[PDB]
Amino acid sequence: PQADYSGEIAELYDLVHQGKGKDYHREAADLAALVRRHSPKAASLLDVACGTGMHLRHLADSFGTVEGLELSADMLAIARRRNPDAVLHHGDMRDFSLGRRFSAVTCMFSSIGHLAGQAELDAALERFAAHVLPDGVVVVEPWWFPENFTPGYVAAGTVEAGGTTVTRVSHSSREGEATRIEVHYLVAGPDRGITHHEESHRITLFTREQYERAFTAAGLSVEFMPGGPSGRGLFTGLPGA
Template sequence: MTTTTDARADEGYTGAVARVYDLVHQGKGKDYAGEAADLADLVTGRVPGARSLLDVACGTGLHLAHLAGRFERVEGLELSPDMLAAARRRNPSTTVHHGDMRDFSLETTYSAVTCMFSSIGHMADQGELDAALAAFAAHTEPGGVVVVEPWWFPDTFTPGYVGAAVVEAEGKTISRVSHSRLEDGATRIDVHYLVAEPGRDIEHLSESHRITLFPRSAYELAFERASLATEFLPGGPSGRGLFIGVRA
C-alpha cells in the first residue's frame, strides 16, 4: 500500500519532503563538508581575517555545521519552518533566524553573506532579485563579500531534463525522480519520491517548484544596484557558477 503526500507548488520544502531532503542529496553525493571548506576559503581569500558569516536560505543547516569551525560567528536564515527546525536541531549552538531573503533585517552585519544551492532562483522577477541583493548588502560589512550560487541561465538550462536517484540511508530506501520543463521564462521542476522502510507502507511524496531563469546580466544588475562590485566564477559546487560581490 502507498500513502501520498503533496507539497503545493512554491510553498518551499515542507513536512515529509524536508525530512528526506538531506538523505537524498547526501546519497546523491553532495559534499557539504567539501563545499563549506571551499566556500570558507573563497571568503577568507577575499576578506583576510573574516570573522563572521550569514548563510541565507540555509536549509537544514548542513553547510552551517561545517562552517561553524571556520569563523568566530556563523548564523543562518531560513524561510521554511520545517527546514528551520531541522537546522536548529542540527546546530544547537548556532543562531538560525526565521526570515525571507527579500526583506529580512537582523540589525547586524557580517564579513560574508552567502546564498547557496541556487536558492536565489526562487525570486520571481528582477524586483525580487534586487530586493534580495539589497538585503544581503545591507548585512555585509564594508569590504565584506556576498556569495551567490545562481540557478541555470536561459542559455545553459536543458528543457525536459530528467534526474533520477535511489539512495539507502537510515533504514530507508528512497527513490527520487525529477522532471524540469520551461515555463514562461522559468524552470518548472516536478519531483516525486518513493520512501520505503521495513514494516511500513511505501510513502509517495511530491513537490513542484518554479525557479526563475535569470540571465547573467540580471544578477549583475542586482549586484550593481546593491552597490556590490561583482565577478562571476564559472564552475562552483553544482556547475552553475558563483557570483562574488564586494561591498565598497
C-alpha cells in the first residue's frame, strides 16, 4: 500500500532497522574512514536520501559540517529533530541544486534503487557530481543487482521497545527489471491494541555495469566494493574522469 515512507511507516523505520541489527554508528565510522582514505582533508558531507538522519547524527562526530536531502517530509521531520544544527533539505535526488559542494556526497542503504531506469540513475549521479568538491568523494550503496538478487526471499523479525512490540515481514519477488518488495507490520501494545500496516515498493535491479556507467557519465572514476554494510556492496567515485 504505501511507497512513500510516510505516517506510521516513517515512525516505525528506526525501530525496525535497529531490531534487524543495523548499526549506523559503525556504518558512519566506516564511511568516515573510507572518505578520509580518498579525501584525507575532508570537512563536509551531504547525505542524499538521508531518511531519518541516523547516519548524519553519527557522521557529525567525524565531519565539521553535515547536511541532508530527503524526499519524504515525514522522514525529514524525524531527521531534522535528530540533527537540529544541520541543514536538511526537502528535495529529490534526481534534480536538486544547493549551490554549494561538499567533501563527500553519500547515498546509503539502497535509496538509489528508487530511481527508474538508466536516465534517472544518470541524472542522480550527475547531481551528486555537481555537489562534490574537486578533491572529494561520492559513495553510493546500491540495491541488489540482477546477478546477486534472491527472488522469493522472506525476512521476518520482531522487536520490542518502550512497551510496543513490532513485527516486520518482507517478501521480495522479481518484477521485470526490479524487485517488488511487500512489507507488512503488526504493531502491538497494551494501551493501543494491534494495528496492521503495509508498504510495497518497486526497487530497480540495475547491474553493476549500469551503476558504473552512471558514475562515468558524471565524470567520476568508479570502484565497487563487494559485501558492504548491507550485503550489496558499495560504490565510490572520484571527480576527474
